């Protein structure tokens, strides 16, 4: 575990499409670097959506509903300014996921606006005015979607058919937390689990009823993020909003086993980092040990 | 003429000058606006790394000592302090390494590295403070850290850990002194001196090998006094107890040989620490780092000192100074609050953050502050208000914290405006709540008696301006039901009519009459039920 | 003592204990025969101490803005702290009316009643230790 | 990239007052051209004006911003004998964009029979409350008794002063900790004011003595973490007064310091957000920043100049 602290309260970083990049809020120049560092780029506008759409291509949605795209030709170290959009949500998207031919996005006010590949024309839009902050977003069976508002409100919706209604709705008995964590299985495109604010372990069976298959509180503060193994579904580890990843050993344990005791964490992709509530500075580099 | 106004961010203040609009055919000539703020003290990209590193070090210092105290008294504390000093030295080394970073053509680093070195000297002083033989060893270590030139190089490295034959003999004689019993060394030096006298560039080297000990002073004169002192600790006697003579040598040798830095070093040798603090103030940096050092000194203040108790007060002042220094970097503000641990600085900088306001991030920061709190309620309410001003989610959060009445008024207006209108609050399990319950009852009635009853109870608790539409809906429900048990409602209906009359007195008419007629029918039905 | 130790009772017991020692010292200075037999027979019938131990255990078991209330107790104020708390609660409700006024009033009655009951409970412990 | 440079106000006539919002991101200006300008500090660091409009018929002396909990409200003050309240308006259709912002009048205060020198919002804890002082020499306090009705401004109180110069400055102390009081500096003897228990009237607790020349400006300092209160006056000398309540009467003043290094009129006195720093400006064209010593004496930290 190497923690190359580089003095930026980092908002995001992800595994290479060793290889990696990073992105950060909380500065004048909106901060994002590649990699021991490749392409440390400045831009105006935050980082809400983040997906390196090729080894060159790289897209990013920003705070004002903005969506910036560029192409990291690491060979010439040049970024082709791929795509721009002014007002998506002007809030940011409050999660980001991927869909086939389009980003499975959602925002706080809920402007589900579908930029797609070469769809500089934003054609499709479920412009349902989501009242609470919709921060839960995924493709389930694309375009099966589910907007989850900040009442944790996991309403299953659609985008492939038309009409702005949602297709279904998942919810806990109380509606206590706001949206921070969910869990679409790599084991199955139907299996999910609601990671919530008490160190809250909830499990959402789509195909087998829809009850709270779990309710288990282990971590301190609100739902941070996790890192699943990108081919080992069972192995993961869970944090809370200070950042403290407990080694939630569902491969087999959970303990005080992070390089912990810090502030918050940035963003999730591991094959390695996660993301807590305050999005702060941390690093790691040995993610199979 | 000067007009000065404080802005809501500390690094953004404005000064303007008023002049006459026209005077002597000449319009105003002072339209310049001066942006007065924090300016020089915090700056730079790499600066950020160094500042960030310093903040991290401060956080570590806060983290360790308190935990150790929780552990309670141990020597561990004596060693724990030494470890922190070592960490500080490592940080200084890292800073020195960073200077390496600057690249051609042209660079700044000597100020960066020279500034860093002063910090290193302080660490050395702290180590010395952390017996005479041990002090001498520390001095030797400091010296190590610090033709004829070739001979000096040969010696300098050693001290920090026929002619040729004569030189070797002189070296052997020098060795026979370090080994010994200090009394044996005293006699060993004398014999070497006698040999030198008997002997009366190679010859000079041989004399140097004899040592004992005159030349070192000459070398210092040619130079530095600190180096001479290090040499003395290393090869003469490795006890460092009396610094009057050494002080004179540095003072006189230095004179024979930046001046402000030398003065600061002299003040440090005096032992300060007030003088050292004054020197730091004169330098003006590092400010926060200096405050941290003062705090460390206060923590150390072990040895039964009344001045130290005053010293403790000075340390307490330093934290306040650091808080004053902090301006707008959120992590830094959190660190400052931790250092403070009261609620003064708390709510103060809280609202400074309010100024600052990314809204979601600010909300997250507020949540973190609330978690830390585990005054506070007022701050939470203020944050809620700010978020509401910045929409529906924020309003819901404010309601949860408790505006609610206003929300009820809005929701009730929305549910009147559109029949097919959908409300999130209604779906989820005061007067506004009663109205929501009534709406739910209406929805139940639409779905197709418990709902209708709940809607009427909601009406009896409270009333609504369209209210007439709600009454019509109730009448429709009665028609669906047939209004068997309303009996009270007909009596209730009359009261509502009286209220309407009162409203008219205070302030579609034909349509309104028709509704009353429809209501009368329900009352008649109730009467029939009573007869039955 | 088996279930409760009153303030006045802990003070009374202490006074009695104080009275016993002086008498013992007086007996010690000069010697009386009836007095020695009474003291020796009395020392032959620890049981009282054992009985008191159970009471102490019971007391320990009993001992076994919330933060503001805790601070007010440490400082000790029912007449001063209690009223302060009531007023503060009123001011805390000041911002929000609450969903039900009657329910809120009931809660207020319930919280202030319980508060003072608990404080008096805490207050005893000091008398039980002193006894 | 960021630069601080001189910027044109865009006012034809002379600028009387500049004020920052709560955040310090926005600035309001007023001038004798009868227009109020609001500046936005862009995230790209250049001040750009948000809007400018013709507020009054006569020159606008003073301006102020209310607490951001109430909303975006600016109050203005003129020689036309009126004070106006304005509320910023932005409209967006329950769709992206569609929001338009323009200056609007919430209300007018006609009650002042003469030209008004100053207007100041009270502290946020009090509610929407403001004071104003005029050539009639009558301090008036207006409240909005309903927060919802920003047009509903009642006249809370009227008190008499003297005649000529004027400035007002509320105690910014948060209430729960402290009582409301306000300093008025006209012309020359100036007497402040406090608030009574349930008389609900302002009383003259004390006066600030030793004032020299006309009273150009006065400000009360934020009392954050200090029991005592501080007020500074820019006369044609700078003074700092320390108020302490202690416990009929319950007030004391001390004079902390006097400073003449301006050698001339001190037109503006301003405080820091914390109350840590004082500033003063004057006819020397110099702006001085002040710190408190450990002794509670003031020292000049440094001087900015301009020409």
From TrEMBL, chain A:
Protein name stated in the entry: MGC154553 protein
A GO cellular-component term linked to this record: nuclear pore outer ring
Keyword Protein biosynthesis carried by entry: no
Keyword Nucleus found: yes
Subcellular locations according to the entry: Nucleus
Swiss-Prot/TrEMBL keywords: Nucleus, Repeat, WD repeat
Native source organism of the sequence: Xenopus laevis (African clawed frog)
Annotated InterPro entries: WD40/YVTN_repeat-like_dom_sf, WD40_repeat_CS, WD40_repeat_dom_sf, WD40_rpt
SUPFAM superfamilies assigned to the protein according to its UniProt record, in alphabetical order: WD40 repeat-like
Pfam families attached to this UniProt entry: WD40 (PF00400)
Main localization (coarse): nucleus
Positions of WD repeats: 172-214, 216-252
TrEMBL record, chain C:
Coiled-coil boundaries: none
Top-level division of the source organism's lineage: Eukaryota
Protein's cellular compartments: Nucleus
Family, similarity comment: Belongs to the NUP186/NUP192/NUP205 family.
This protein's name: MGC83295 protein
């Amino acid at each position: 575990f190497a923690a190359k602290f580089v003095s930026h309260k980092i908002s995001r970083t992800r595994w290479r499409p060793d290889v990696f990049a990073t992105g950060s809020w909380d500065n004048e120049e909106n901060k994002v670097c590649v990699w021991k560092q490749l392409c440390d780029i400045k831009h105006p506008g935050d980082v809400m959506d983040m997906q390196f759409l090729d080894k060159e291509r790289i897209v990013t949605g920003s705070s004002t509903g903005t969506v910036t795209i560029f192409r990291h030709h690491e060979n010439n170290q040049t970024l082709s300014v791929n795509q721009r959009w002014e007002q998506a949500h002007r809030a940011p998207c409050t999660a980001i996921v991927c869909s086939s031919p389009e980003i499975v996005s959602v925002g706080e006010d809920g402007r589900i606006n579908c930029f797609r590949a070469e769809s500089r024309d934003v054609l499709r839009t479920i412009d349902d005015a989501d009242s609470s902050t919709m921060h839960g977003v995924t493709f389930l069976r694309t375009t099966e979607i589910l907007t989850v508002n900040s009442v944790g409100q996991l309403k299953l919706w659609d985008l492939r058919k038309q009409g702005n209604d949602p297709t279904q709705i998942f919810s806990v008995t109380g509606e206590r937390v706001p949206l921070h964590c969910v869990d679409r299985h790599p084991n199955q495109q139907h299996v999910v689990a609601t990671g919530g604010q008490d160190g809250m372990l909830c499990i959402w069976d789509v195909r087998h009823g829809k009850m709270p298959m779990s309710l288990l509180n282990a971590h301190e503060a609100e739902m941070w993020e996790v890192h699943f193994h990108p081919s080992n579904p069972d192995h993961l580890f869970t944090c809370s909003e200070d950042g403290s990843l407990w080694h939630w050993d569902a491969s087999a344990e959970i303990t005080n086993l992070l390089p912990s005791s810090t502030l918050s964490v940035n963003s999730l992709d591991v094959l390695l980092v996660c993301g807590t509530d305050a999005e702060a500075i941390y690093v790691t580099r040995r993610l199979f040990s | 003429h000067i007009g000065f106004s404080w802005g809501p961010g500390d690094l953004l203040l404005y000064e303007t000058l008023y002049q006459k609009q026209g005077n002597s055919e000449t319009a105003a000539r002072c339209p310049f606006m001066y942006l007065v703020r924090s300016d020089e003290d915090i700056y730079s990209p790499v600066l950020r790394k160094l500042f960030n590193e310093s903040h991290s070090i401060f956080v570590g210092l806060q983290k360790s000592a308190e935990e150790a105290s929780g552990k309670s008294r141990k020597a561990q504390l004596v060693q724990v302090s030494r470890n922190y000093r070592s960490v500080l030295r490592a940080c200084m080394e890292e800073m020195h390494t960073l200077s390496e970073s600057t690249r051609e053509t042209a660079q700044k680093y000597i100020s960066q590295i020279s500034i860093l070195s002063a910090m290193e000297l302080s660490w050395n002083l702290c180590e010395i403070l952390f017996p005479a033989g041990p002090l001498l060893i520390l001095l030797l270590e400091w010296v190590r850290l610090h033709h004829e030139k070739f001979w000096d190089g040969v010696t300098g490295y050693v001290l920090q850990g026929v002619l040729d034959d004569l030189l070797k003999k002189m070296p052997m004689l020098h060795t026979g002194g370090t080994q010994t019993f200090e009394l044996k060394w005293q006699h060993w030096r004398e014999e070497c001196e006698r040999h030198l006298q008997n002997g009366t560039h190679m010859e000079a080297v041989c004399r140097v090998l004899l040592g004992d000990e005159e030349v070192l002073l000459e070398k210092r004169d040619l130079m530095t006094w600190y180096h001479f002192l290090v040499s003395r600790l290393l090869f003469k006697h490795p006890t460092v107890k009396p610094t009057e003579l050494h002080f004179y040598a540095q003072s006189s040798l230095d004179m024979f040989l930046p001046e402000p830095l030398d003065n600061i070093l002299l003040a440090a040798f005096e032992f300060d620490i007030h003088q050292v603090i004054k020197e730091f103030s004169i330098v003006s940096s590092n400010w926060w780092f200096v405050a941290h050092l003062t705090d460390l000194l206060d923590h150390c203040q072990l040895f039964q000192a009344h001045n130290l108790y005053f010293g403790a007060n000075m340390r307490e002042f330093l934290l306040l100074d650091y808080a004053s220094g902090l301006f707008s970097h959120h992590s830094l503000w959190q660190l400052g609050v931790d250092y403070f641990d009261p609620n003064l600085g708390r709510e103060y900088l809280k609202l400074h953050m309010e100024r600052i306001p990314s809204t979601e991030k600010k909300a997250l920061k507020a949540l973190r502050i609330c978690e830390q709190r585990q005054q506070v309620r007022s701050i939470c309410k203020t944050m809620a208000m700010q978020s509401l001003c910045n929409a529906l989610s924020w309003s819901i959060r404010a309601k949860d914290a408790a505006l609610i009445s206003d929300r009820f008024l809005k929701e009730y207006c929305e549910r009147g405006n559109f029949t097919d209108l959908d409300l999130i609050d209604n779906l989820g399990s005061l007067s506004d709540r009663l109205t929501f319950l009534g709406k739910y009852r209406e929805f139940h009635r639409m779905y197709s008696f418990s709902e209708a009853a709940s809607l009427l109870l909601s009406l009896m608790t409270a009333r609504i301006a369209p209210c007439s539409f709600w009454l019509t809906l109730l009448l429709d429900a009665l028609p669906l039901l047939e209004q068997k048990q309303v009996i009270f409602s007909a009596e209730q209906t009359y009261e509502l009519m009286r209220c309407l009359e009162d409203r008219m007195a205070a302030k579609i008419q034909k349509q309104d009459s028709s509704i009353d007629n429809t209501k009368v029918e329900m009352l008649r039905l109730a009467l029939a039920r009573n007869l039955a | 003592s088996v279930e409760e130790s009153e303030i006045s009772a802990m003070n009374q017991m202490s006074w009695l204990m104080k009275t016993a020692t002086i008498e013992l010292r007086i007996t010690s200075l000069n010697r009386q025969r009836s007095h020695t037999q009474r003291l020796l027979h009395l020392l032959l019938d620890r049981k009282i101490l054992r009985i008191l131990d159970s009471i102490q255990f019971s007391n320990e078991i009993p001992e076994p803005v919330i933060a503001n209330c805790e601070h007010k107790n440490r400082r000790g104020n029912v007449k001063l702290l209690h009223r302060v708390l009531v007023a503060e609660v009123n001011a805390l409700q000041g911002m929000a009316a609450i969903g039900q006024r009657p329910l809120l009033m009931e809660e207020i009655n319930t919280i202030l009643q319980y508060v003072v009951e608990r404080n008096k409970l805490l207050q005893c412990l000091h008398a039980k230790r002193h006894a | 990239m960021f630069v601080a440079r001189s910027i044109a106000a865009d006012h034809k006539d002379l600028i009387h007052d500049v004020s920052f919002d709560f955040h310090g991101r926005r600035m309001a200006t007023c001038s004798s051209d009868q227009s109020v300008k609001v500046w936005d500090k862009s995230e790209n660091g250049n001040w750009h004006c948000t809007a400018s409009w013709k507020t009054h018929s006569g020159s606008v002396w003073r301006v102020t911003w209310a607490h951001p909990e109430f909303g975006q409200v600016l109050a203005s003050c003129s020689f036309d004998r009126t004070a106006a309240v304005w509320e910023e308006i932005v409209g967006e259709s329950n769709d992206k964009l569609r929001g338009q912002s323009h200056w609007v009048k919430r209300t007018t205060l006609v009650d002042s029979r003469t030209s008004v020198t100053d207007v100041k919002f009270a502290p946020k804890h009090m509610g929407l409350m403001l004071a104003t002082c005029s050539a009639d020499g009558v301090v008036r306090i207006y409240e909005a008794p309903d927060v919802m009705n920003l047009s509903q401004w009642s006249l809370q109180h009227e008190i008499s002063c003297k005649l000529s110069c004027s400035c007002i400055s509320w105690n910014p102390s948060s209430s729960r900790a402290h009582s409301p009081m306000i300093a008025v500096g006209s012309d020359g003897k100036v007497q402040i004011y406090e608030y009574n228990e349930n008389t609900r009237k302002y009383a003259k607790a004390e006066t600030l003595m030793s004032v020299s020349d006309p009273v150009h400006d006065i400000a009360f300092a934020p009392n954050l973490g200090r029991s005592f209160h501080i007020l500074a006056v820019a006369t044609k000398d700078v003074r700092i007064f320390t108020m302490k309540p202690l416990r009929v009467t319950k007030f004391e003043i001390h004079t902390v310091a006097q400073f003449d290094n301006h050698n001339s009129q001190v037109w503006r006195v301003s405080w820091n957000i914390t109350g840590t720093v004082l500033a003063s400006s004057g006819d020397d064209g110099t702006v001085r920043l002040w710190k408190a010593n450990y002794m509670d004496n003031w020292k000049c930290i440094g001087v900015l100049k301009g020409d």
